[PDB]
Motif scaffolding. Structure first.
Motif, short mmCIF file in Angstrom:
data_model
loop_
_atom_site.label_atom_id
_atom_site.label_comp_id
_atom_site.label_asym_id
_atom_site.label_seq_id
_atom_site.Cartn_x
_atom_site.Cartn_y
_atom_site.Cartn_z
N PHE A 59 0.84 -1.05 0.06
CA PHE A 59 -0.06 -0.18 0.05
C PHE A 59 0.90 1.08 0.07
O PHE A 59 0.38 2.25 -0.04
CB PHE A 59 -0.94 0.10 1.34
CG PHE A 59 -1.85 1.25 1.43
CD1 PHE A 59 -3.00 1.09 0.81
CD2 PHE A 59 -1.43 2.00 2.16
CE1 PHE A 59 -3.86 2.38 1.09
CE2 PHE A 59 -2.05 3.34 2.47
CZ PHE A 59 -3.33 3.51 1.73
N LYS A 60 2.41 1.13 0.03
CA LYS A 60 3.22 2.14 0.17
C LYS A 60 3.03 2.91 -1.27
O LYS A 60 3.43 4.00 -1.20
CB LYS A 60 4.47 1.64 0.25
CG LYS A 60 5.19 1.90 1.57
CD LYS A 60 6.26 0.95 1.96
CE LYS A 60 6.58 1.18 3.46
NZ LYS A 60 5.59 0.03 4.32
N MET A 61 2.55 2.26 -2.27
CA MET A 61 2.35 2.81 -3.74
C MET A 61 1.47 3.80 -3.72
O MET A 61 1.25 5.02 -4.11
CB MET A 61 2.20 1.83 -4.60
CG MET A 61 3.48 0.97 -5.00
SD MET A 61 3.03 -0.36 -5.96
CE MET A 61 1.34 -0.78 -5.42
N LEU A 62 -0.12 3.40 -2.96
CA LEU A 62 -1.16 4.67 -3.05
C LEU A 62 -0.72 5.56 -2.00
O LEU A 62 -1.28 6.51 -2.15
CB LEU A 62 -2.30 3.51 -2.77
CG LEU A 62 -3.58 4.52 -2.46
CD1 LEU A 62 -3.96 5.34 -3.43
CD2 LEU A 62 -4.82 3.33 -2.55
N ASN A 63 0.04 5.34 -0.92
CA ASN A 63 0.29 6.18 0.09
C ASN A 63 1.07 7.35 -0.44
O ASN A 63 0.71 8.37 -0.65
CB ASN A 63 1.19 5.32 1.31
CG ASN A 63 0.70 6.37 2.59
OD1 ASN A 63 -0.27 6.69 2.82
ND2 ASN A 63 1.92 6.32 3.14
N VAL A 90 -9.03 7.05 -0.52
CA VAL A 90 -8.91 5.78 -0.72
C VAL A 90 -10.14 5.13 -1.22
O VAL A 90 -10.09 4.56 -2.40
CB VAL A 90 -8.77 4.96 0.47
CG1 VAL A 90 -9.28 3.64 0.55
CG2 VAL A 90 -6.99 4.52 0.73
N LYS A 91 -11.33 5.71 -0.71
CA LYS A 91 -12.54 5.42 -1.25
C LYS A 91 -12.78 5.94 -2.63
O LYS A 91 -13.54 5.66 -3.33
CB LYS A 91 -13.73 5.80 -0.36
CG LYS A 91 -14.32 6.92 -0.64
CD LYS A 91 -15.37 7.56 0.20
CE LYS A 91 -16.63 6.38 0.46
NZ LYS A 91 -17.60 6.60 1.66
N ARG A 92 -12.11 7.13 -2.88
CA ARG A 92 -12.22 7.57 -4.36
C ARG A 92 -11.46 6.74 -5.30
O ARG A 92 -12.23 6.38 -6.19
CB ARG A 92 -11.69 8.92 -4.37
CG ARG A 92 -11.66 9.89 -5.52
CD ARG A 92 -10.89 11.01 -5.71
NE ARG A 92 -9.62 10.92 -5.86
CZ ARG A 92 -8.89 11.22 -7.12
NH1 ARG A 92 -9.62 11.59 -8.12
NH2 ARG A 92 -7.59 10.90 -6.99
N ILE A 93 -10.20 6.47 -5.01
CA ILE A 93 -9.57 5.34 -5.84
C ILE A 93 -10.57 4.06 -5.77
O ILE A 93 -10.16 3.27 -6.65
CB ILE A 93 -8.20 5.32 -5.22
CG1 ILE A 93 -7.34 6.58 -5.41
CG2 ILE A 93 -7.37 4.18 -6.36
CD1 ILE A 93 -7.59 7.37 -6.55
N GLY A 94 -11.08 3.99 -4.91
CA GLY A 94 -12.10 2.62 -4.67
C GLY A 94 -10.94 1.45 -4.32
O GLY A 94 -10.89 0.48 -5.26
N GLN A 124 -2.83 5.67 -15.69
CA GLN A 124 -4.32 5.98 -15.89
C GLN A 124 -4.94 6.03 -14.44
O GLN A 124 -6.29 5.97 -14.18
CB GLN A 124 -5.11 4.66 -16.34
CG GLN A 124 -4.42 3.83 -17.53
CD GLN A 124 -5.13 4.57 -18.80
OE1 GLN A 124 -6.48 4.69 -19.03
NE2 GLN A 124 -4.41 5.26 -19.96
N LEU A 125 -4.01 6.39 -13.31
CA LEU A 125 -4.91 6.55 -11.85
C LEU A 125 -5.13 8.01 -11.71
O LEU A 125 -4.69 8.84 -12.01
CB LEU A 125 -3.78 6.06 -10.73
CG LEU A 125 -3.66 4.64 -10.57
CD1 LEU A 125 -2.46 4.44 -9.48
CD2 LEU A 125 -5.17 4.01 -10.08
N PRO A 126 -6.24 8.01 -10.97
CA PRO A 126 -6.84 9.52 -10.86
C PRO A 126 -5.91 10.42 -9.97
O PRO A 126 -6.19 10.85 -8.90
CB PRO A 126 -8.11 9.15 -10.13
CG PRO A 126 -8.48 7.82 -10.29
CD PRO A 126 -7.16 7.27 -10.35
N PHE A 127 -4.62 10.45 -10.43
CA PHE A 127 -3.70 11.33 -9.99
C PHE A 127 -2.92 12.00 -11.11
O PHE A 127 -2.61 11.45 -12.36
CB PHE A 127 -2.92 10.65 -9.03
CG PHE A 127 -3.19 9.97 -7.84
CD1 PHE A 127 -4.00 10.92 -6.99
CD2 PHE A 127 -3.31 8.88 -7.82
CE1 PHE A 127 -4.69 10.29 -5.71
CE2 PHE A 127 -3.95 8.16 -6.54
CZ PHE A 127 -4.51 8.97 -5.69
#
Length: 238
Positions: free
Chosen positions: A46-50, A112-116, A153-156
């Motif tokens: 999860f270090k990646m999404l963090n 987190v819930k945004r990225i789902g 393609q990630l919402p960032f």
């Protein structure tokens, strides 16, 4: 051919799935192909999404240096000043816990819930929810995530995404580039081991994957790579 991967997992006396996604067509391989849609905690994957959530929300930058204030840590190469980038190559939990405490529950949950991501529930202790839940995510969902990341393609903002991608390089041999991030929850039973990344192929083709396997405390870390390397050679991705 899917039959022979069962040899590597039979034989390493483990039990895990190797999910692979090449442009939406997802294919399981392993010897316990049912894990693919079972939720596990992410651990240090999860270090990646963090990173993204942090970099993006400007709670840090790829150049901020994180200062080791004396306390003893899980490994020894962790007791030193280091940047997010190096904290990444080393799975150094206390850094990203600081980052998480910077982000703070509300931001942290909402993105987190945004990225789902996974069940998208982090409960309350914003500095542990990925190591002992309540956050869990199935190996299918992980490869699709790390897919989107590799395709930017990630919402960032793309600039963030490219940055994260520059921390995750693991081997650059033969024009093959392999990215990914290990995870290991030794503190729950049975232990889950992760390893989620992708191959930037010589022609630029991209091959995401998500090794999930059930760990026991006696195996060496390089058991997760022993599997994946010789796997991606049977599948001939190298």
């Amino acid at each position: 051919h899917n039959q022979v991967i069962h040899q590597y997992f039979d034989e390493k006396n483990t039990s895990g799935v190797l999910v692979i996604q090449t442009d939406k067509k997802i294919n399981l391989y392993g010897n316990a192909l049912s894990r693919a849609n079972t939720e596990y905690v992410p651990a240090s994957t999860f270090k990646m999404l963090n990173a993204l959530i942090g970099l993006e929300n400007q709670k840090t930058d790829i150049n901020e240096i994180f200062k080791w204030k004396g306390e003893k840590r899980s490994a020894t190469a962790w007791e030193k000043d280091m940047t997010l980038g190096e904290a990444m190559k080393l799975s150094a939990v206390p850094v990203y816990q600081e980052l998480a405490r910077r982000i703070g529950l509300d931001l942290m949950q909402k993105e987190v819930k945004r990225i789902g991501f996974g069940n998208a529930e982090i409960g309350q202790q914003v500095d542990n929810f990925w190591l002992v839940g309540p956050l869990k995510v199935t190996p299918i969902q992980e490869v699709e995530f790390v897919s989107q990341l590799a395709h930017t393609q990630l919402p960032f903002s793309e600039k963030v995404q490219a940055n994260v991608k520059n921390m995750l390089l693991l081997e650059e041999s033969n024009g093959y580039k392999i990215f990914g991030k290990t995870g290991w929850a030794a503190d729950i039973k049975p232990q889950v081991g992760w390893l989620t990344g992708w191959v930037e192929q010589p022609d630029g083709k991209i091959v995401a994957f998500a090794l999930n396997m059930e760990m026991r405390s006696e195996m060496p870390a390089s058991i997760r790579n022993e599997l994946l390397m010789k796997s991606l050679k049977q599948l001939n991705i190298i």
